[PDB]
């Protein structure tokens, strides 16, 4: 299948095992901004659901399909690849909705639907938007979509912006200097210090932060889910040119994202920005191993290049330079192995 083609069997196994935990479904369900906003987007756009056919891609517990039911949908196909599907089925019975929600166990790239749908709903956003590669599954599902049908969410915006955080930066060396000891129980560990530094710098940092670390207004990269194709996400090139609003040492780029549900009645947004209340997505920061000095008014240009891999994530390559000086920094990160820093 398209799925097994781009995915190492073992990565898939781990992945659906994770989502097979009620505890992990719960963690997402309890994100109030997330779950509350999904519900509000669907109900306030009741005309996009009333008496409609819906496809819920990766339905998990069923929760989004219950919201589609609450807004008056006639038939909701709820696809789910983990063993959580059997739990979703129990809930459909116990909520007496067996003639309106049909749970279909399997990967959306492999199952069959008995008809085409008016609208597709999903929550496939990973941290940094793209982690997990599930947006490709959401896009793949468009094969089930009637001409002029809709997608909820409709578009995704990724935001990038430069930050200064001297302490975050210096902490990497603090940790690595464990190895800079000539006699750890009599053993000279020094030779591994460089490797230890490199290891820490490859991990994107997942936590939140005060917006005052941001040194310029974000640039955004948009994905239109109505128009995009799966292959558009195999190589994601994000050029940037930042107009520096603050002088200082630039230690990396910060990442967040927003999605919009563009309904017939209204457009509703779900934001994971550091200006908004916290979500279980936090925000993401990728450091430079060499920081860049800039001054307010300078221009920081470069490219963030995301290259999909077979473990349902991306290899991150970031190259940036301060134009006025031509000072430059380049960095490689493993999106599937982040440092979860928070508390």
């Amino acid at each position: 299948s398209v799925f097994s083609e781009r995915t190492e069997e073992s990565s898939a196994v781990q992945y659906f095992q994770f989502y097979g935990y009620l505890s992990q479904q719960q963690n997402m369900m309890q994100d109030y901004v997330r779950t509350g906003t999904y519900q509000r987007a669907i109900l306030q756009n009741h005309t996009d659901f009333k008496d409609k056919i819906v496809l819920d891609v990766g339905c998990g517990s069923g929760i989004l399909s219950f919201f589609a039911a609450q807004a008056g949908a006639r038939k909701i196909y709820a696809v789910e690849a983990s063993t959580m599907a059997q739990h979703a089925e129990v809930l459909v019975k116990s909520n007496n909705l067996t003639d309106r929600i049909v749970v279909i166990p399997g990967k959306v790239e492999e199952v069959s639907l008995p008809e085409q749908v008016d609208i597709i709903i999903s929550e496939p956003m990973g941290y940094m938007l793209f982690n997990e590669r599930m947006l490709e599954s959401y896009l793949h599902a468009k094969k089930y979509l009637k001409p002029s049908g809709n997608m909820f969410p409709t578009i995704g915006d990724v935001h990038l912006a430069p930050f200064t955080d001297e302490q975050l930066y210096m902490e990497q060396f603090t940790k690595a200097n464990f190895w800079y000891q000539p006699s750890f129980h009599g053993v000279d560990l020094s030779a591994l210090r460089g490797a230890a530094v490199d290891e820490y710098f490859r991990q994107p940092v997942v936590d939140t932060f005060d917006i005052r670390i941001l040194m310029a207004k974000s640039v955004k990269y948009t994905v239109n889910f109505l128009e995009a194709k799966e292959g558009d996400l195999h190589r994601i090139e994000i050029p940037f040119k930042f107009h520096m609003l603050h002088s200082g040492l630039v230690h990396g780029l910060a990442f967040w994202f927003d999605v919009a549900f563009i309904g017939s009645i209204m457009t509703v947004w779900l934001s994971t920005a550091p200006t908004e209340p916290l979500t279980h997505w936090y925000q993401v920061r990728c450091l430079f191993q060499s920081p860049l000095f800039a001054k307010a008014g300078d221009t920081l240009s470069g490219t963030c290049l995301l290259i999909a891999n077979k473990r349902q994530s991306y290899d991150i390559s970031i190259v940036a330079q301060v134009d006025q000086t031509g000072s430059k920094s380049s960095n490689l990160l493993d999106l599937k192995n982040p440092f979860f820093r928070y508390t």
């Binding site: 994770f18 982690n131 997942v206 916290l278 279980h280 997505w281 994530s313």
Partner: peptide
């Protein structure tokens, strides 16, 4: 990855 979704407060 190991824990694709992060634990929230």
């Amino acid at each position: 990855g190991k824990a694709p979704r992060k634990q929230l407060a």
